[PDB]
Ligand binder design. Sequence first.
Ligand SMILES: *[C@@H]1O[C@H](CO[C@@H]2O[C@@H](C)[C@@H](O)[C@@H](O)[C@@H]2O)[C@@H](O)[C@H](O)[C@H]1NC(C)=O
Length: 218
Amino acid sequence: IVGGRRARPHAWPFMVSLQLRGGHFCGATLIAPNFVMSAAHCVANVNVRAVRVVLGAHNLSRREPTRQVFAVQRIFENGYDPVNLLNDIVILQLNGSATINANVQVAQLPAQGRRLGNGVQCLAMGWGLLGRNRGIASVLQELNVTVVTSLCRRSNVCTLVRGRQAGVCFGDSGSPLVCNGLIHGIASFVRGGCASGLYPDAFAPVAQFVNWIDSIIQ
Ligand SMILES: *[C@@H]1O[C@H](CO[C@@H]2O[C@@H](C)[C@@H](O)[C@@H](O)[C@@H]2O)[C@@H](O)[C@H](O)[C@H]1NC(C)=O
């Protein structure tokens, strides 16, 4: 997240870090005690057996006893198209069930088909790059963003920060976009580099996938 702010610790208890060999590479969202959702492109070319699903995290540079770590048992896909980055969503079934507590909680999802228009105010978040040269965040970042339809496909939810250069960045893919308390996006791609101030950030449109999500988390 470029131009955001540190989240209060455990403000977003559905927020997940996906890690390989102890390094964060993508976000995810806890959607049931034994399932997370992320971007399909995050796991498309990764050793899934090596992915660690880290719940309850805030500062990835510190030892945190609030954390719960799981492996991926199974993946569920829904027509990911890597050339066009369409249907950029995956569900990862965990090898066990999270202990739900103040710091680890399931997210709330919108109704199937709900489409956000221009001007909805959302919060993006993640542990991705902080900007040019500064690397992956240590502390979870959040960012106020606004939904836009200009320079967005109908197959995405897009957002833009007005009046300054800010937005999501590499390592934020898979992270939730929260709008009126509900997870309406999964971070998918940028254009023109991160935080261009021109192209909106593109998210997988969670509401288009809710019946499918519901069918899996049973
Ligand atoms: C679920 O998996 C947890 C994490 O396993 C660790 O991470 C994966 C990616 C592999 O590297 C594995 O060899 C590691 O041990 C375990 O800590 C936990 O006990 C498991 N829970 C159940 C219920 O099987």
